[PDB]
Amino acid sequence: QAVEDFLRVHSELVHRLAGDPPDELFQRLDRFVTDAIIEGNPERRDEIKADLARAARVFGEALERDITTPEDFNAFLRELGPEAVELVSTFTQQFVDVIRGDPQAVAEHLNISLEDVARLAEAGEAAIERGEGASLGVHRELRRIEARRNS
Numbered sequence: 001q002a003v004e005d006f007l008r009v010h011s012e013l014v015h016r017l018a019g020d021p022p023d024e025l026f027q028r029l030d031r032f033v034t035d036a037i038i039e040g041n042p043e044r045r046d047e048i049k050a051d052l053a054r055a056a057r058v059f060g061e062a063l064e065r066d067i068t069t070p071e072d073f074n075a076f077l078r079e080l081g082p083e084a085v086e087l088v089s090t091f092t093q094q095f096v097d098v099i100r101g102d103p104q105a106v107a108e109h110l111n112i113s114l115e116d117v118a119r120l121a122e123a124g125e126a127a128i129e130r131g132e133g134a135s136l137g138v139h140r141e142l143r144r145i146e147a148r149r150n151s
């Protein structure tokens with residue numbers, strides 16, 4: 001559907017909160033994750049895709065508020081209610097699961113080694129534990145990987 005609204009505002013908030021410039025690799029990985037969550041259950045595809053619609057609305061509203069840190073965003077989720085809080089934390093954990101569920105595909109799309117794909121999953125896991133969400137962790141780790149290889 002028009003859940004490219006989600007991918008737009010998601011990328012927009014994530015790179016802002018991360019402190020990073022926009023990154024085509026993150027965008028590509030983000031699209032791969034959202035597609036993996038849609039194909040993971042064809043018997044419940046539209047149920048999955050509308051969880052994104054409710055999240056694409058959540059990140060859109062987030063961009064309308066004064067949110068400078070993950071803690072602000074976490075507070076905005078609570079003001080939104082448990083549907084949205086669980087919604088983000090479900091997606092952010094699925095982000096890590098998708099990477100682990102097909103590391104060679106991630107390696108393919110991003111043209112990186114499998115060891116660097118493990119860095120992405122690891123970076124996402126640690127950012128979830130810090131309360132920042134996996135997307136921010138993965139955004140920042142993608143910069144290091146680019147620097148070690150490109151530079």
Ligand SMILES: [Cl-]
Nearest residue numbers: 011015022023
């Ligand atoms: Cl980005």
